[PDB]
Structures are given as C-alpha cells and as structure tokens.
Write a protein that binds this ligand. Sequence first.
Ligand SMILES: CC(=O)N[C@@H]1[C@@H](O)[C@H](O[C@@H]2O[C@H](CO)[C@H](O)[C@H](O[C@]3(C(=O)O)C[C@H](O)[C@@H](NC(C)=O)[C@H]([C@H](O)[C@H](O)CO)O3)[C@H]2O)[C@@H](CO)O[C@H]1O
Ligand SMILES: *[C@@H]1O[C@H](CO)[C@@H](O[C@@H]2O[C@H](CO)[C@@H](O)[C@H](O)[C@H]2NC(C)=O)[C@H](O)[C@H]1NC(C)=O
Ligand SMILES: *[C@@H]1O[C@H](CO)[C@@H](O[C@@H]2O[C@H](CO)[C@@H](O)[C@H](O)[C@H]2NC(C)=O)[C@H](O)[C@H]1NC(C)=O
Ligand SMILES: *[C@@H]1O[C@H](CO)[C@@H](O)[C@H](O)[C@H]1NC(C)=O
Ligand SMILES: *[C@@H]1O[C@H](CO)[C@@H](O)[C@H](O)[C@H]1NC(C)=O
Ligand SMILES: *[C@@H]1O[C@H](CO)[C@@H](O)[C@H](O)[C@H]1NC(C)=O
Lengths: 321, 321, 323, 170, 170, 169
Amino acid sequence: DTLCIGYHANNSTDTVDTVLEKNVTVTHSVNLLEDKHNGKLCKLRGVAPLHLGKCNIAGWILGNPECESLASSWSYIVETPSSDNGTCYPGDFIDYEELREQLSSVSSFERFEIFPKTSSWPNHDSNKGVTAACPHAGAKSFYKNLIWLVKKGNSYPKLSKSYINDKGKEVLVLWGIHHPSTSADQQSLYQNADTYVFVCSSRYSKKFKPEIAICPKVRDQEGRMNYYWTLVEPGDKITFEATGNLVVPRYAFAMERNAGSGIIISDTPVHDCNTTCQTPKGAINTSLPFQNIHPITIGKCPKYVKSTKLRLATGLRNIPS
Amino acid sequence: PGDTLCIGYHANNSTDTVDTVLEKNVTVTHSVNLLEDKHNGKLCKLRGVAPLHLGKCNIAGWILGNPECTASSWSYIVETPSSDNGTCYPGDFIDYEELREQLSSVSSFERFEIFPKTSSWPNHDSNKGVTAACPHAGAKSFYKNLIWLVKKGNSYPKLSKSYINDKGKEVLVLWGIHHPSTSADQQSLYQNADTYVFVCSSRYSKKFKPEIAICPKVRDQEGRMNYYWTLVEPGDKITFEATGNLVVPRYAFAMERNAGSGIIISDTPVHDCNTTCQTPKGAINTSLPFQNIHPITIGKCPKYVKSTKLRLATGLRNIPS
Amino acid sequence: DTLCIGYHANNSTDTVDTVLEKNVTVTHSVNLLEDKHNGKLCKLRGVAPLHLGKCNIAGWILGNPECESLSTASSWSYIVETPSSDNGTCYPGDFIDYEELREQLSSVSSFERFEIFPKTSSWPNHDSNKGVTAACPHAGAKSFYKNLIWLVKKGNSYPKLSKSYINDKGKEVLVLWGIHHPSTSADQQSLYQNADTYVFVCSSRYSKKFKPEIAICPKVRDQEGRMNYYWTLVEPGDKITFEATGNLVVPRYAFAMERNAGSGIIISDTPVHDCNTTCQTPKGAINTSLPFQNIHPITIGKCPKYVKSTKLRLATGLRNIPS
Amino acid sequence: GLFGAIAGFIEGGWTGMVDGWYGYHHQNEQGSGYAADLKSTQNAIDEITNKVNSVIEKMNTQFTAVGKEFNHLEKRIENLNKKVDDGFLDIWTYNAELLVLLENERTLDYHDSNVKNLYEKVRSQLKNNAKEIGNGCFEFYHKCDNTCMESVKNGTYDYPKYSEEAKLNR
Amino acid sequence: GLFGAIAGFIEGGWTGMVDGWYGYHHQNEQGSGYAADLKSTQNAIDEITNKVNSVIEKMNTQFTAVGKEFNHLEKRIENLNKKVDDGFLDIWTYNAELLVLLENERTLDYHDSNVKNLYEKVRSQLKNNAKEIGNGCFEFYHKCDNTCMESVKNGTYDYPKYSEEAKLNR
Amino acid sequence: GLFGAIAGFIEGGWTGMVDGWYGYHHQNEQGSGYAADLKSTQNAIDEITNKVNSVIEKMNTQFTAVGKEFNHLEKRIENLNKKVDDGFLDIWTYNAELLVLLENERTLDYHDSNVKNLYEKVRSQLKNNAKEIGNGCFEFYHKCDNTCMESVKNGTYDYPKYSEEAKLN
Ligand SMILES: CC(=O)N[C@@H]1[C@@H](O)[C@H](O[C@@H]2O[C@H](CO)[C@H](O)[C@H](O[C@]3(C(=O)O)C[C@H](O)[C@@H](NC(C)=O)[C@H]([C@H](O)[C@H](O)CO)O3)[C@H]2O)[C@@H](CO)O[C@H]1O
Ligand SMILES: *[C@@H]1O[C@H](CO)[C@@H](O[C@@H]2O[C@H](CO)[C@@H](O)[C@H](O)[C@H]2NC(C)=O)[C@H](O)[C@H]1NC(C)=O
Ligand SMILES: *[C@@H]1O[C@H](CO)[C@@H](O[C@@H]2O[C@H](CO)[C@@H](O)[C@H](O)[C@H]2NC(C)=O)[C@H](O)[C@H]1NC(C)=O
Ligand SMILES: *[C@@H]1O[C@H](CO)[C@@H](O)[C@H](O)[C@H]1NC(C)=O
Ligand SMILES: *[C@@H]1O[C@H](CO)[C@@H](O)[C@H](O)[C@H]1NC(C)=O
Ligand SMILES: *[C@@H]1O[C@H](CO)[C@@H](O)[C@H](O)[C@H]1NC(C)=O
C-alpha cells in the first residue's frame, strides 16, 4: 500500500526564462507584453480626431482654398505624411509649432467673421488680393480666412480697425505681412513706399516694416508673406493699424483649448472605433502594463519597451517524462 | 501524562494590514509606513534660510519697485495667487520667466543707487516722470527703481551714461523703453520725435526705437512701456545712450545667484520653521522615500507617488484567533 | 565510519550587503559597478572626434587666424574643445543661435570647406583686401577670420551690393556672415561711405533684414564697435542671396556637410587617442559589459547607466565560514 | 529547486493528474489512481492570480501625448525630449525584463514549496507506520484502505489505530 | 506559507507571549507559561530593522526644484516638462507599489522560516526522547523540570541523561 | 539563513574542500579526506553565472549624448535638463542598490538551499542503515568502504544490501 505526493504535468510547450535558467517549459503562463494593435486611427475619450487629409495645419487654419475638409471638437489632429497643402504664398509662419500644439485638442471651436469683408474696408481694395501661388481650381486665389488688401484708385489710406472679444472664450486671430520683391511692386500694391503695420491687444504688441528685396522664387514668387497669430482673451480688444502691406483677418476662431494633446502624422485610416491609447500605426486595446507597438502614443497607455517577449510563469515546470 | 514544550509565535491586538504580491489585507503584528502623507501646512526655511515673501506683490512689482509694494538672501520665493500687477504702466517684460528663475534663490543681494538721482542727469528732468498708471496715495507716481526722464525746458540732449561694476558680483540692471501713443506725446515728453536708445555691456547689446501707436487702453495708457534687464559681470561696464524714450536705472541690485530653486505660489503661511523639503501646501520632514502630498516640491524630497498606502510589514501575520 | 555533508570555505575577505545583513563575508563575488575608465578621448563608433585645439567652435567655424581650417577631417563623431580654448570671435559681438550651431555640428559624416565667393573675382565694385583689425591679430599683424571677408568701400563709394550662391554641392551648405556695427558715424562713413544702410539675406527658407546699430560700446579687444555673426543652412538646389549698401561681412568659405543624429561636445584636457570605444566620458572612455557606472553623468554612446554608488558587490558564492 | 521536491526527489510530473497542480497517487486493494489536493491547488490558484493581477493593476499611467514637434532651430530641446523618451524606454525595459526573470523564479519556488509542504504534512503524520521509500512515495507498514488514505490527506490520520499492525510488519 | 510553520502546522499565534516574536510554551510539574526565545527574536529584530533602514536609506535624493514657469508661447516645453514629471510619477508609483508587495511577501516568509528553524532545532535535540504531538508541540517521554526545559531553549540539552527514562514510556 | 543549514545545523564551512561549493568528507577504516559533489556544484555554477549574465544582458541602452549647452537666458530649460539627469540618477541609483541587496539575500539563501537538499538527499539514501549524528554528519550503523562511500555520492547506494547488518546495531 502506497501514498505518493506529486505534481501536475501537461502537453504545454510554452517557455519562460527565469533569473537562474533560460527556456524553462512550464504548464501555464501569461503574457505581460501587449504587441497587438488594430491598424486604425480611432476616437479618444469618445471624441474623434481632426483629419486634415492632404492639407497641413497651416493650410487649414489659414483657409487654403484646397482645404475644404470637415467639427466643433477634436481629441487630436491627424495629418498625412504627404500633406504639402499649407502656406501657398511663401514666407515665415511665426511660432507655428506652438500654434499646432495649442490647437492639438479643443473642446469647442467656432469660425466667425471677425472683420466682415463687405463692410470693413471702404477705402481699400478687397477683391484683387489673389496669387497663382495659391490657386483654386487652377485660378488665382488666396487664403479664405484672410484678405490681402491693396490700394484703391491710387491711394492706400491709413487703416485702423479694432475688435473686441465678446465671445466669452479665447479668440484665435491670424494675419499676414506682405513683403514685395521690389519698390516698384510696393508702390503698385500700396502706393506709399515707406509703410508700417501695427498690431496690439492688451497683451500683444508688435510693429512691422516691409522688407523689400528680390528673394529666390518659391512657387514662382520672389516676394514673401509672413504669418502671425495671437489669442485674444475674453473682453480684450485687438487693434490693427497699417499704411500698407497688411493682410487683414477675415475669419477668426473662438475656442476653448483642452489640456494638451498631440498631432499624429500617419497614413493610417480613421474609423468609427473607440480607444484609450492611440498609436500612429493603430489603436491599442489592452489591460497590459507594457507595449512594444510604438513609443509615440497619445492617451492612457502601457509603457513602451523594446522587449519582444515578456512571459510570466503561472504554472510550474512541465516535466511529463 | 507527558510534560510539554511548544514552539510558537507572537500575536497581538494590532489591526494594521499590509498587501503582499500573493494576498491582500493581511493583518500583521507590526508594520511601518513608507509613504509620507503628512505636512506641517507651513512654508519654512530651506537649508536654514528663509524664503523671500512678496506680500501682495509679484516679482515684477517688487524688482521694479512699484510704489504699492530687507533680506540679503533667500532660499526660494513666495507669491500669493492673487498678487497685484507688478508692471503698472502696461507693456511687455522681456524674458520675465527667466529673470524670475534667476532670482528664485540668491545669497548676497543688495539694492544700491547705480545712477544717483541728484547728480546723474543735469540736462534732463528726473522729477516729472510720474503717471496715472502707477498711482500712489491719490498722486501720480512711478517705479522707485527707475527714473522716467523727460525733456527739460523744451530740449532733450543726447544722454550718455556708463556704470562700471565694482561690486565683485553680478549686477542686475533694469530699464524701460517708452512707446508713446502719438507724435504729440513723443514731443511733449522728449521733444525730438525721431529717437533711439542704445544699451550695451561687454556681453549685451541692443538698440531700441519707439514704436508710436494707439493700443487698447490699459490703466488709461494707449501707449506702452517695455521692461528689459541684464546681468553685468563683475568688473564689466554697461552703457546707456539715448535721444529720448529711455526709462533709466536708478537702483540696481548686486547679487550672487545660487544654483537656484523655484517660486512657490501659494497662500500657505510662512513660519519660522526648518525643513529639507518644501511643498506649496506645507513642509514635509523627509525620512521616508515616498510622498503623496504634492508633486511640485523644492529641496531634498521623497519621490512623489500616486499611492494612498505603502505599508511595510515588519512583524509576522497576526493570528490571535 | 562517518560521512559528512558540507560546504566550501576559503581565505577570502570579500564582503557584501544584503537587505537583511551588512558586511557578510562570501566565498566568491563580482562587482556590478564599472568604476574604471581609460583616461583617453577615443574614436566613437570607429570615428575620431574633431579636436579644436586652442579654438572654440566659433573661432574654428569662422576661421579665426589661430585655428586650423581644414585640415579638419571630413567627418567626426563628436567635438572636443579644451577648457583653455581662448580663440573664438576675436572681433566682439553676438553669435546668433550659437548653441544650436554647436549641437548641429557635433557629429558629421561629411564636411568640406570650399570658396563660396572667391575673394578676387566676386567683389569688383568693393574693396575685398583691407578688412583686417587689431582685434584679430595673427603672426604679429592685423588679420581677420579666414572664412569671411570684411568688405569696405572702393575709393569713395559703396555701390549697392548683390550676390547669390546656388547650392550645387549635392548636400546642405552652411553659410556664415557678419554684420558690422561701427562705434561712430565717422567710422560708418570711413568704412562704408553711406550713412544709412541695410543688409538683406534670404534663401527659399531663410529671410532677415539687418540694420546697422551705431553706438560706442564697452571696449573689448580694443573694439568699441561690434560685429554680430549669423548662419543658415542652404539645402541642395537652393540659392542664398546677399544684398547690402554697407556693413556686410561677406562669406568667403562655406561648408558642404551631411550631419548625423545626436552626439555632443566634450570640453576637457583629456588626451585624444587612437582607441575605439562605444561609450565616451569627458575624463576617459568606458569599456565594460557592466550595466552601471560611477565615472561621469555626461556620456556619449551606448553607455552603462550612471549611479552615485561607490560599489555594487554581487554575491556569487556562499557565506564564508572558515572558523 | 529551492525546496528540493519538484525536479528534485520528486523527479517527474504526472500527466495522469489532470484535476489540479499538486496531489497524491494512492495504491491499495480497492484500486489506485491520481487525485489533486484541491485545497492546496485552489489556494495556489487564488494566490498566483493575485500575483498576476498585482503586476498588471499597479500600472496606472498618466494621460500623455509623448509626441513633440520642434523646428530646425530647436535641435537642443529636440534632443532633450529624445533623452527623456529614451531614458523612460531603458528604465521600463530593464524593469519589465528583470521583473519577469525574478518573479518567474519566485513562482517556481512557490510551487516547489507547496509540494514540499504536502510531502512533509504526510511525513509528520505517518512516522513509523510507513516507509519513506523516497521519490515522494510512502509505503505503509499496515493496510490502508480508502478512508485511511483520505485521512492522511485530510490531516487526521489516526496513528494509534494502526500502531500495532504497523510495528509487526517491521 | 512558504515554510509551512506559520498559519500552517502551527495554526495560530500567542497573545500571551508578549516579549518576543518567537518563543516557547512549556508545561511541567513545576508549572507552565510563555517565554520568547531571545536569540532568534533579537536576530530577527536586527535583520528586519536592517531591511527597513535599507529601503529607506538607499534613497539618495538630489536637490531639485520641480516647479517651472512657462509663458503662453512655451506650451511645447511646458508639456515636455509635464511629461518628465508624469514619467517619474509612474515610474516611482509602480516600483514603490511592487517593492512593498514583494518585500512584504518576503518578510512573512522570513518569519515563517524563523519559526520553522526554531521548531526543527528543538526536534533535533530531543530526538526520540519526546513525541511530536503536532501544532508545534513536543510531549516528553521523560520528566522535564525547569532546568531541563531551559536547557532545551538555550541549546544546552543533555539527551543521554534522559535516554533511559524515555525508552520506558513508549 | 532561510534553510537553516549554512551556519545552521552545519555550523561552518570546509577550507579543506577546495574543488567545489558543496561536498562531502568521508572517514572510514581505510582513510579520510574531502570531496566536492560535482553535479550539485556545477548546477549552482551554471545557475549563478546565468543570474549574473541576466542582470547584465537585460541592460541594453540607447545611443545617447547626455550633455546639453544652454546660454544665460535658457536657465529654465537648463534646469529642466538638470531635473531629467538627476531623476534618472535617483531612479537608477535606487534600483541598482536594492537590486544588489535583494539578489544577494536570494543568492545566500540559494546556497543554503542547495546544501540542505544535498543533506536530505543522502539521508534519503542511508535510511535505516545510518544515524544522523548532527552537524551534517552521518554515522554508518554498518561498515562502509571506499566503493560503498561512492555509491552514496552518486545516488546508487543499496539499502536492502545492508538492512540486515544494521538491524542488530
Ligand atoms: C516674360 C515676362 O516678362 N513675363 C511677365 C510675368 O513674369 C508676369 O507675371 C507676374 O510676375 C510677377 C513678378 O514680377 C508676379 O510673380 C506676378 O504674380 C502675381 C501672383 O500671382 O502672385 C500676380 C498676382 O495677381 C499678384 N497679386 C496681387 C494681389 O497683386 C501678385 C503680387 O503682385 C505679388 O505676389 C506681390 O509681390 O503677383 C505675375 O503675374 C506677367 C504679369 O504681368 O507679365 C509678364 O510679362
Ligand atoms: C493684473 O492683475 C489682475 C488680477 O488682479 C489680472 O486679472 C486677470 O487677468 C488674467 C488674464 O490676463 C486672467 O487669467 C484672470 O482671470 C484675471 N483675474 C480676474 C478674475 O480678474 C490682470 O490681467 C492684470 N493686469 C495686467 C495689466 O496685466
Ligand atoms: C588667441 O588667443 C591668444 C591668447 O591665448 C591671444 O594672444 C594675445 O593677444 C593679445 C592681443 O594681441 C596680446 O597682447 C597678448 O600678448 C597675446 N597673448 C599671448 C598668450 O600670446 C590672441 O590675440 C588670440 N588670437 C585670436 C585671433 O583670437
Ligand atoms: C535650521 O535647520 C538647519 C539644519 O537643518 C540649521 O543649519 C539651522 O541652524 C536651523 N535653524 C534653526 C533656527 O534651528
Ligand atoms: C575592452 O576590454 C577588453 C578586455 O576585457 C579588451 O581586450 C579590449 O581591447 C577593450 N576594448 C576597448 C576598445 O577598449
Ligand atoms: C477532515 O478533517 C476534519 C477536521 O479538520 C474532520 O472533521 C473530517 O471528518 C476529516 N475528513 C476525513 C475524511 O477524515
């Protein structure tokens, strides 16, 4: 008569490493490394992203004619790696990264006409401000959100327009400063020759002088146009004053910025799915603590590691014999 | 019938529990907490040196000597969350966050009259430079550390003024540039109309020109005043030149900067206590490795964690039965 | 007749700590802490550093007369300045985005100096042969940066200048120039004739207008005037254009380069050697499989992690009980 | 292993014992076969589940974007950001790898401990009345029917009951 | 659990033994009572104290002012800074939580080991001069007065002295 | 120690046994001497070196240039950079220190375990034909020569072949 003490063994081939010995076959185990994703760009916090298609943020916020995309809210922004469509008229976009970052997630967004075109500029020409650098259906055109003002009937009066923010939230205001290639063009566009532009709120204040020189052609333009922006706080006023060279605001955006999100640049399609962790390669749906999909993630994510295998033993050494 | 000797372990009335990797809520006979969760609700000396407390003012107001606002050294700076505006005359304080950072902790700090008011400006008026934007006791006034020089008897000669740093330590120098709202104001203050200011040390060099414009009224000013600063190395010289629009240094500050600390913005009261770790909510006596009081700390602190309890078992499982 | 089961002991006095007990003598142990370096600056990833001698990055790149101008390898894995490197911007002024440039030059896989604007043929209407100064002395004589030319008026006029460079080099070209700010109006006229001047520099991406700022500043290397230095990278196929009516210190030599990723700048007297390393320290290179090191926090390469530990004795044998 | 039993003096495992992790193999008149000790098994199952859940659930991470965009004149800060990302990567990689190595050894010790404990629980009960024939087995010096076995497993083996018979077969 | 003594074959602890972690209860002709073993208790106290001080004192903290101030055009670097604080937050939270869970399990095992060793050290002395009656108790086959008891507690037990009397009561 | 052998019931070690970590000392009519157990010594060496190699090879770091240069007006980011380096310093210094303290304990316990399992291995062989005389020693209730003495060291000892001789002693 015998009584024996013993332990289980099964048909398992799963292997784990221990500190003392590598490749121990065990009866049961679990994976701690999430290595799957869904190859989709999905919603975050239930909120879809802003997909800009073939356009970049600059082209979209300025109103590049090529950028008639479609929301009042977004969790993050998506640009495609092949998104050229932005500053069609060449020049410097000041603090562009900062703006991109600050627009990365908004809880409320509203485009309004801050300086109505039909009524704001009686002493200036607001119809001839177009260029082949910014075509619309092959035709000369310009940013939809700004107006390139030029002299009217051989005169460019000193303009002075102020706007008071009665929106009850931050208003994003963008404008341009045009620099002709020649004194000849300066006179043709603005008459005056030696001009200035002044923008100031209660916070913001900067003076601009045209910088006239022949620069290397870009999209066939030897001239330059620099783009500027600011956020006018509720109740604050912003004032524009110019004697030439000012590319006035037409549309501005009232908004409530949301904590801080990010910008994904990927060809990965968007779908009607939901996630808590987003990767440029697809969403991660895991309860696991570690992940080796992508280091650049947005949301509440597992930690990125360069592990290929993170397998925890649960059972014991498998020795069927 | 036998005599007996039994081997056993301690139990007691202890209700302390701990978690282990294998089982939750295990009652143990003895334990210690690894998590510090208590603070003294006071702002104390760090390294035995008191913080600088700015009362109702902010660094700008304090350092410029705003009329509304004796420590030769401090370990950090405290501002209350509802501190008054430092700059009374509206404008931009250039590299403001940097200056704050660089003043966060100093040893040796001495305000001295760099350009004595009595003898420095024989050809300009150093009395009439007061303003409704910086009121004091029902009277127009101005910063105590600067002088708003204006023309004397319809003339504003070129001014040229230099200081050599013989303090044996860094000298902080602050000045202002005034940008009137109109040409009339320009001439009324400085006579000259087209002016410049130049400030250069061996390391610093900048030229300023007034940018006349009507900006939104702030404390009744449509004009603006920008504030600048630089740190003059020992033995170096700083020069000021101007034909108008220069708000000149009156008092400067000799200081030795420490590696630096930070600025605590809080209504928590300062007290004559000692600590090695300061929090905006209060000080913590660092013995333990971890701390859940506040992620923003100054000093030699325990690491911040999101933990509610880190109970370390010292004794054994408590089984009184 | 007895048989005993037992364990090893020896003469060793190696000691280790455990969570439970301190100074436990053991039979065998190993250190997990790398505390040795070789006391040399080595080739990283097979490539020598660029050692700047008595010059800093500014003096070297501008061609301070004391620096050795290429020469300079066509590649390097990092840069070494000595703590005593004295020769930089000999004519006093601001070097714009200097730290950015230093970082961007720290590691290069290709680097070639070439005469972007030949001294003799480029400036028919201006004087390209007088731009020297006591601030930048050489073999006991006034001199200047080798890679720039201080253009001055010819005879008694300074015609409007206009000159471009189109990048045919097949890779990024680093172009540097200066803007001179005389101490007085007298000097402005003495040098440039024109009293009110401007400089303009633009490419497809860069654009900046410069305006001379005449003032008498504190004397540095005998100069009350100032000279500010600027730079930009001209991508392949693009053109950079210079326009001036005075005050422009024109490029003479520029640099065709292919930059790598990271790397950094070591400032040290530690001798450079023909040794190879994967981890470099300002005080010597690290050669170790160990995961931790206490040599230096500032390292370049694939390095062990820096810790403040003094020893990290790992037990391999058992408690040593010779009794 | 640390406790000597598994892959030790108990050299191999029982595929036959499909009902649990640890158990017994009994043999006598009436029959024989494998039977897992459901008490120690379930206990071990609960405890290991808690282990696995601790490693997972103690990871509660902040909401973070990670990605940053810097221009051509922000190389230094672009590389600072890269150092942060890479520092976090080296830390979490080393930590995840070692956690698994270390805790895998612990888990194997744990199973070994559970078995050893079963084995000694039987040993302290039987004493004389049985032969410790090694390899994890005990040979009884007395007849041990089903309810006798069950008793040994249940920890209520009546030593005196079989004392007499036991001595005699010795 | 790991060593089988605590909450194992010795089912419960003793509120009556209030001067140590591990000790004995004796019962003889002269009387009965509790007595902590001072050797094993102090050694444990020393070692558990060393454990706590190690987890504490190995935390060399740098002087750091965590806080930073950024203006409205510095959100990218403000967010990098946030990423840094949040990265250390998750790293320290997870490791501290696991350190505690893991060291706690080790601490209990340590005590369980200490008790197990104490029991088997007595058992090795007494040999067959007493019977293991379970629950951590030995019942002597011979008379064991105070001095006899105290000699078992402090290792200086004289087995051959009671050999004769022992063999009788079996 | 955890397993109560090393510095436990086997009070001390043997300087005389130089060819291994664990082993035997025999003493019969013929002679005496020390002899390491090769199979248990080699496994421990296989496992300990694997433990050393694991702690080392799991550290596979990124190519990094740690240093940064910031000017006199970039103090904030310079201190941010400083907070990053110091944060990694504290994380790695702590982890390294505790890794060592904890694994050193485990290693010493590991040896303790190996010795105990070897002792209980031979006690499992000599069953009734020997007496545990303490301090890790067995005294044969019979007479054991060199050939027999090697049977116990290899796990081939023959109990029933001595059972009768020992029953009388
Ligand atoms: C062989 C020859 O002489 N060909 C010219 C041909 O170059 C010229 O085209 C004009 O070239 C000028 C440069 O000198 C500009 O590039 C003009 O482009 C536009 C533009 O599309 O951007 C035309 C546009 O209508 C203008 N918009 C406004 C609001 O004025 C702008 C604008 O003036 C500039 O961008 C400001 O710098 O320029 C381009 O038409 C044609 C046209 O006259 O004549 C040929 O003889
Ligand atoms: C001076 O201080 C006042 C507060 O005493 C500032 O008022 C705040 O303005 C900021 C935006 O600039 C808001 O974020 C706060 O909500 C305002 N406080 C409230 C509730 O009134 C004011 O901006 C400061 N003025 C100047 C000249 O800077
Ligand atoms: C390079 O640095 C050296 C010093 O290391 C400079 O040499 C000095 O130059 C001044 C000015 O002419 C002389 O008065 C000194 O006698 C020199 N000192 C030495 C050590 O010789 C030199 O000027 C620098 N050259 C450049 C172009 O920067
Ligand atoms: C404050 O504490 C520090 C040490 O922590 C000491 O140097 C200093 O003297 C103390 N001051 C007082 C008032 O105790
Ligand atoms: C690293 O060390 C090995 C010996 O451990 C030596 O042979 C080799 O040359 C060293 N490598 C370098 C490049 O320092
Ligand atoms: C198991 O033990 C319990 C007491 O713990 C007892 O009541 C029960 O009858 C036992 N079962 C068997 C089969 O002996």
